Amino acid sequence: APRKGNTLYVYGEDMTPTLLRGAFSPFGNIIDLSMDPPRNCAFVTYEKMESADQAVAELNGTQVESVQLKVNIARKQPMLDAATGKS
């Protein structure tokens, strides 16, 4: 698949774009990162499903200075359902 984008669900408080980009920057490259201020949840798209596995698995179960970040799976980004794999 020449195109990909695994959107990830991120939940937390007082979260910023640059901060989230750093939490998913090293995990992999993001093709589309969206933030939701009304639900306090940010969405991160990864070019490979593995980038979301390390970020969602490493980010999930982590606490900040005084906050917690929960990662889940989003059903958005259907243009390529994230990517391809055994599923």
Side-chain angles (χ1 to χ4, degrees):
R3 295 185 191 238
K4 303 183 181 181
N6 195 5
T7 294
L8 315 185
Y9 182 86
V10 182
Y11 182 85
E13 300 183 351
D14 304 341
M15 296 190 304
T16 20
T18 306
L19 179 79
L20 295 142
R21 184 181 189 98
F24 294 91
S25 143
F27 284 88
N29 192 63
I30 303 168
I31 69 180
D32 194 3
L33 192 112
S34 303
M35 294 189 73
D36 294 36
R39 295 188 190 246
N40 299 321
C41 69
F43 294 92
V44 185
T45 311
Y46 266 135
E47 187 185 0
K48 299 184 188 272
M49 294 191 199
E50 295 182 351
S51 307
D53 291 348
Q54 185 182 353
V56 171
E58 198 183 326
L59 301 167
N60 187 355
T62 71
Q63 189 186 349
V64 211
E65 293 185 352
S66 160
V67 182
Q68 295 178 345
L69 238 110
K70 302 182 180 229
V71 190
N72 295 345
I73 307 311
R75 296 187 193 193
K76 297 183 181 165
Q77 201 53 271
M79 31 135 233
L80 216 295
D81 298 344
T84 190
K86 297 189 296 135
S87 146

